Write an enzyme that holds these catalytic residues in place. Sequence first.
Site, mmCIF file in Angstrom:
data_model
loop_
_atom_site.group_PDB
_atom_site.id
_atom_site.type_symbol
_atom_site.label_atom_id
_atom_site.label_comp_id
_atom_site.label_asym_id
_atom_site.label_seq_id
_atom_site.Cartn_x
_atom_site.Cartn_y
_atom_site.Cartn_z
ATOM 1 N N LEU A 73 49.333 -18.991 -38.013
ATOM 2 C CA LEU A 73 49.783 -19.934 -39.045
ATOM 3 C C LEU A 73 48.367 -20.890 -39.483
ATOM 4 O O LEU A 73 47.285 -20.853 -38.890
ATOM 5 C CB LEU A 73 50.571 -20.760 -38.357
ATOM 6 C CG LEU A 73 51.890 -20.449 -37.806
ATOM 7 C CD1 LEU A 73 52.539 -21.386 -36.640
ATOM 8 C CD2 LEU A 73 52.884 -19.693 -38.752
ATOM 9 N N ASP A 74 48.593 -21.177 -40.642
ATOM 10 C CA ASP A 74 47.438 -22.145 -41.135
ATOM 11 C C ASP A 74 47.901 -23.721 -40.907
ATOM 12 O O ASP A 74 49.025 -24.088 -40.373
ATOM 13 C CB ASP A 74 47.321 -21.923 -42.671
ATOM 14 C CG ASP A 74 48.539 -22.218 -43.364
ATOM 15 O OD1 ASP A 74 48.236 -22.842 -44.547
ATOM 16 O OD2 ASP A 74 49.616 -21.804 -43.140
ATOM 17 N N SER A 75 46.929 -24.247 -41.301
ATOM 18 C CA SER A 75 46.948 -25.969 -41.134
ATOM 19 C C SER A 75 48.288 -26.601 -42.043
ATOM 20 O O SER A 75 48.554 -27.552 -41.729
ATOM 21 C CB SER A 75 45.940 -26.684 -41.198
ATOM 22 O OG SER A 75 45.458 -26.781 -42.608
#
Lengths: 110, 102, 120, 86, 172, 56, 155, 80, 67, 110, 459, 113
Positions: free
Chosen positions: D40-42
């Site tokens: 996942l990304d931020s």
Amino acid sequence: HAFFKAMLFMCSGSIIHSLNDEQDIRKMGGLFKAMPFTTTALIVGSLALTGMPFLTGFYSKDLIIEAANTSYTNAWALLMTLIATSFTAIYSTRIIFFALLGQPRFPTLV
Amino acid sequence: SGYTPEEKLRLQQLRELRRRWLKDQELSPREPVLPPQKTYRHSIFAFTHVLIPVWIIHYYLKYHVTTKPYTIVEKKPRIFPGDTILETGEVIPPMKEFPDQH
Amino acid sequence: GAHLARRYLGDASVEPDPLRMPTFPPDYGFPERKEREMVATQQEMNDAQLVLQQRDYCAHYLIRFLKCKRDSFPNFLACKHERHDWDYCEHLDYVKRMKEFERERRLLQRKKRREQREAD
Amino acid sequence: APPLTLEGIKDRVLYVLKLYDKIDPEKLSVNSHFMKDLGLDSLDQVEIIMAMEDEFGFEIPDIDAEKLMCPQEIVDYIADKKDVYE
Amino acid sequence: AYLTHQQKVLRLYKRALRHLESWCIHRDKYRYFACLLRARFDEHKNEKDMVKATQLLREAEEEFWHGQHPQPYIFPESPGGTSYERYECYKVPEWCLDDWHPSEKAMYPDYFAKREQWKKLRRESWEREVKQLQEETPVGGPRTEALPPARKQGDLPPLWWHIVTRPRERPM
Amino acid sequence: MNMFSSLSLVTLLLLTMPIMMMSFNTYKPSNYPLYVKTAISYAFITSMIPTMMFIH
Amino acid sequence: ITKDMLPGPYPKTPEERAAAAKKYNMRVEDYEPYPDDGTGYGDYPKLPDRSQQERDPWYDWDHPDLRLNWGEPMHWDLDMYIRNRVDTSPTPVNWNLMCKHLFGFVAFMLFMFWVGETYPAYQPVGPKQYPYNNLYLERGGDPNKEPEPVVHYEI
Amino acid sequence: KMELPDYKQWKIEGTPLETVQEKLAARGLRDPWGRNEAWRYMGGFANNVSFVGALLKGFKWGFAAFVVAIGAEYYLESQK
Amino acid sequence: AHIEPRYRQFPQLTRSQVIQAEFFSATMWFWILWRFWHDSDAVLGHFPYPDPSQWTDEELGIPPDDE
Amino acid sequence: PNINKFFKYLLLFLITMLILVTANNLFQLFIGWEGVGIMSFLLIGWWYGRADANTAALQAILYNRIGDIGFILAMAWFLTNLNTWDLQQIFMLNPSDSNMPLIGLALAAT
Amino acid sequence: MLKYIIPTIMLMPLTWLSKNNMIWVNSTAHSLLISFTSLLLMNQFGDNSLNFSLLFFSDSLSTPLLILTMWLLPLMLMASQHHLSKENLTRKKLFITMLISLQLFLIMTFTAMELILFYILFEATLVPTLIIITRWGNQTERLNAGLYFLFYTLAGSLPLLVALIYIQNTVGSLNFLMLQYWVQPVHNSWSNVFMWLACMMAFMVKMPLYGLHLWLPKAHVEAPIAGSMVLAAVLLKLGGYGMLRITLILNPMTDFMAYPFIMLSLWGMIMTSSICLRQTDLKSLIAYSSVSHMALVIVAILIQTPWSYMGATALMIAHGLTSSMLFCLANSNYERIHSRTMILARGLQTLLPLMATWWLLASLTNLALPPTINLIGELFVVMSTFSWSNITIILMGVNMVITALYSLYMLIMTQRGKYTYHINNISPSFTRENALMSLHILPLLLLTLNPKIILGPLY
Amino acid sequence: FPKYEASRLSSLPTTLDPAEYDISSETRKAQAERLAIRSRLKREYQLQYYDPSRRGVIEDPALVRWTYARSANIYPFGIGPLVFWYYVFKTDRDRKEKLIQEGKLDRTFNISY
Ligand SMILES: CCCCCCCCCCCCO[C@@H]1O[C@H](CO)[C@@H](O[C@H]2O[C@H](CO)[C@@H](O)[C@H](O)[C@H]2O)[C@H](O)[C@H]1O
Ligand SMILES: CCCCCCCCCCCCO[C@@H]1O[C@H](CO)[C@@H](O[C@H]2O[C@H](CO)[C@@H](O)[C@H](O)[C@H]2O)[C@H](O)[C@H]1O
Ligand SMILES: CCCCCCCCCCCCO[C@@H]1O[C@H](CO)[C@@H](O[C@H]2O[C@H](CO)[C@@H](O)[C@H](O)[C@H]2O)[C@H](O)[C@H]1O
């Protein structure tokens, strides 16, 4: 007024307590069937507040309104009072609609 | 963006102590060690909180307040036509016949 | 009511002044007016301790209602008939005032016409 | 209110995550790093923390929220704020 | 700003979503506009021209200011919430127990036996904690407020007492 | 006059009694809120009597 | 404490302007006195006139309620800026626009009320009629002075 | 100690959350948090009354007892 | 306690609370209908409002303008 | 934990209102008038660790003592012109030039 | 008055011949006994005052001031015996001697028939008060405070001596009973304008009048607790008492000479009330509250109406008990944290629940909640000032609003909110401290039952 | 978008401050220096706050400096209010005194003063 206004506050306190101190009507909803007795008191109290015929609020509000508009009176004041009476039904609907109707919007641990 | 390994280790160490401090806040069975020491309940309440108070108030009003002038002042009773006065037995006449409009 | 629109937006001359009514003589156009008849006497209303705004031409019905209310205690639902007689008398007293207003309005119109008929 | 427990908090944290489409429930563990192990990304991590705020009915300030990068760290954070020691 | 560019963008995103939730109220409606708001952030996710990216952030903050809810939802215990600080009047500091009368302490013989073990643990650890902060701090004093962990078995992290023994959030 | 004046004052005096037993040390703090609630319920009854006399 | 650590006269030279900043725990760039108009500020720093409500809630302040740290210089009007008093936090509506709208609403209301007084509403009804010379005696009239009679007629 | 409802049962199908998925799917988007909201549209929380239906709560029973009363009233006079 | 909380599910309701709520909702509606059946005038109108445009000039004593 | 104190305040809060209602002179009525202001202040600021509650409680006092300026004005006028604070003597004398005392009472009611 | 003067003098031998550890017990016990007998001065008649001898007399103005004075001595001893615990024994006995001699001068000041005898004792009170502040004060500034106190007083007192002596030459006597019958009107002239100022400015400085008040906040911040108690409770009221006496011989010149001083008072009470909102020192705040309260007393005396003097007497008594109680409450905080900054120690209701009750009661009297004698005095002054000029109700009303604002501000700042984390030496309130507060408030509230005994000669 | 217009009682939001985004190593260095001063004070306070043997008040020089600065200069608006109020009250009383002389002021029941 001392009857249904006090009831309304106790009815909101009942909801606030059940929802762990949440007071924002946006995180309520879906309480019509979950809180049957609070719902009944919250609907009786709202109809009294808005002047439903023959509830406690009708025996003063309606006598007061008919005496206002048949009096020798400031016409602007008479108009503001009537528009405000209409507003009483509006924010009364807000509480019922957002607190009791729709889907639950409160946290998951019920 | 997460914890540095030095931050994690400090959080872990503080957490161990905290959870131990919170555990130590629990009361043992013997604590607190205390030093050694519907009709009926409502009937005594009426006796002590209505009957005795009204005994003292009625005594106060009857034998002190009402013995001074104008301490208790009543609006005199309304007299309607046809009534009878207890003090004198006087009879108030009736109102003359109405137009009987209806 | 419409009477307000007429006075404030139309012709204020031929609209009665609520404060200064009546302005014509009582007997202008009425041959042999009778006086209003008051049933209850001043002493009877003084004894019954009626509020002064209640000592109008309908006071006898109010005194009749008040006595029954006191005798019917605690049946607070009694006296419905006596209450209505008082309400109805106060209703007729109100219509009389509406007639006086309308009479004043029509007289003010007659006076206006009698001028334009006279102006030429 | 009903009291919270360390395993009670853990179960509800993994419950929220399992109901997240971007995660594979079978690969989800208490120690799975959101950015390293779950990809996942931020921007996703922001939404996960919000779903945790909504879940437990309280706010995690941005300074703290940015550092919670696995399910176990959220459980430790929640347990600390609500004095859960179990 | 001490915040980085990433921190500013993520803070805006969270704040923007929360105000959107206030406008939408209903969950299905919020879910719909929450996805459209995410898409706007995803479109420019890969911008590399940092001057251009900073412009995008600046314009998004003016858009947020114009479109913010005048009365956004606040969690009850958050700053500005309806329960914020409601229980502070019930939080009594632990040192108050030192002034308890002996008869009061005798009601909890077990609690006050444990409490003395903590006060012992605190006294015996203080010198090591002070020494550790001395040997780790560079000349001129610290530059940040981060505190070190214990680097040794039997040691406690420096300056722990008021963290560990702080009052419960529901103290009564 | 006796009943009307006497019962109208016990109403006011009845409500101050829980304040006396508090601020003067003489009651049982076991369930003070129930005690204060009971006084209000009884003071309502006493006050209703002068109301009926006025209504009558 | 000691005199050298207490507030002093307005700092003339850049060197006195450096001992003051050190004394107040401020960078020599951030330190600025009040204008030397002889109002009595001495060398006390002039700090931004912002409310304590504007400070960060989530930081771990030494004094959480005041949102203050131990040793940081205190604003001159700090007792006026505590969270119980004057707030300066940004508003969702511009200040000047708010003042216009609130004034506009009130000024409109007062004007319309005056209009409503000049053109009152009433019913098409004649004056209420009362018996006994308009209740001359009941209203407190002198029983000696027979009043100008008032006669009401059936209509 | 608390047992949680099995998580696999939460589904957006047959709820307004699905309409949202169709409305987004037009634009090439997806709601990954849909199942987290589904419980609000399922079970006892589905099929809430309308505002008029809320106001008319208890009307069915109130109206009946009203008929039994005016019926009783108009019978206590017919005898008289 | 005796109402065990539930996760993501409709709450447990006692039969006493449901009946009492329904009983008092019927008392309200019964009351409104019973009061309306007897006191409809309080809502609609107690007395007929006269039409002043029908009153004859002979009722109001308006002398003819020729006079 | 202070529920006993809370009910004591609700009871004092009620007593001062009943002193207000039955007051037969302006000074006795003022006792109840100010009494409900204090009890309101002590009950709004119930959770006294919360800064907002302390601010709201003081706000209630502030706005209420601005009204009490009008109350004192009516007291000052009635004593000066009618030589009384008793309601009986005020109504018996029934002053015609009652604009100043009633503006005071209107401000107090505001 | 010998039955009060002689026992008061006997307190000096009692302290000095008392066993080393019984000085506070013996002086406290026997000074309380003297306070008890002071109630025998309540033998007051409707027409004639109580005139004992050629030297001393007592009326309904001096009697409540005498009772307040003799009550204050035991209270001052209790308040002082903790911060004087480490003092040298002989210096303890000298501190108590200064307080006993202050009571001696005060009871004779309030009962002297003649104005020169009143003047000498009116001035004798300076010496003990100055010695207490400067010898037993705590900080460096106690030396400046003593000087401002001394020279502010004397700059006004010395002209008064000249004026009083001139009055005896022209009238033939300064006996107050004699002046009641030989008083002649004062006509317009510059000689009379300055005679009026000479007779009044010494008392104005004691009240103190706004403008001439800046000595008072200095003295209070520097005095020991007992100094602040007598200074606020009684010594301020020397000025008011003297005014209520000497205005008898200043009529009708007071009709127009009072205007500059009523404007100072009416505006000064608003200014000093607003200053209280921004004070950082708890003792300075309470000091500035006295200036505001005594502004009402100045106005009441100067307008000379039966209602205004009745209100003036009640305020001086009510203020005396309230201001003394507030100083004691702040001092109890000071004895713990050793600072007078108000914002230093917060949220003390959490740590000292019963002392927060005293803080609440003292604040409620300070803002004149009815039916406290604090409000009976305030209300009577407002009633009379309204008849003086109707507009005054605006200034009077504003002052009450601001008075409530800083009274509750002080309560909220020190007792409510969150406690200060690093202050960890807040010990439970001592029985001495709790009894000290109750011996202030309990008489003050008891007087609402029988307010006539504090309304003065015009009741 | 209508632009924020700051006021004395309505400061500019940080997110709308142009100075908030434009940054140069001078500002970053300046921020680091402030964090250094804050961290040094924090450590000094924590060493006394956390000391087990400390019973008392941690004296704050900043709080001492503040009270000293604001309790130092005193000057209790000069004659203008006193002259203004003098004219308001004198005119009122002269106006009222004249009416009483002529019997034109109503004091029918005024017997309390
Ligand atoms: C049932 C409700 C009955 C009561 C209704 C009461 C209505 C009262 C309406 C008051 C409106 C007054 O507010 C008025 O609005 C406009 C629009 O912002 C303001 O004007 C402002 O906005 C526009 C620009 O966008 C410009 O005019 C100007 O640049 C700016 O000052 C006026 O300066 C202000 O005077
Ligand atoms: C002074 C006049 C007094 C008039 C009083 C008239 C009698 C009042 C009777 C109240 C009946 C209470 O009992 C309750 O009734 C309602 C409506 O039938 C029922 O509710 C019914 O509809 C709902 C919605 O579909 C279902 O959830 C429920 O299972 C079903 O039974 C409840 O199951 C029953 O518990
Ligand atoms: C805080 C300071 C307050 C200061 C207050 C100042 C008050 C001002 C008072 C002015 C009046 C003084 O007193 C005034 O003196 C002279 C005496 O020479 C009197 O007048 C008499 O002497 C003068 C001589 O110049 C003649 O003009 C006049 O014919 C004669 O009657 C006035 O009738 C009297 O009114």
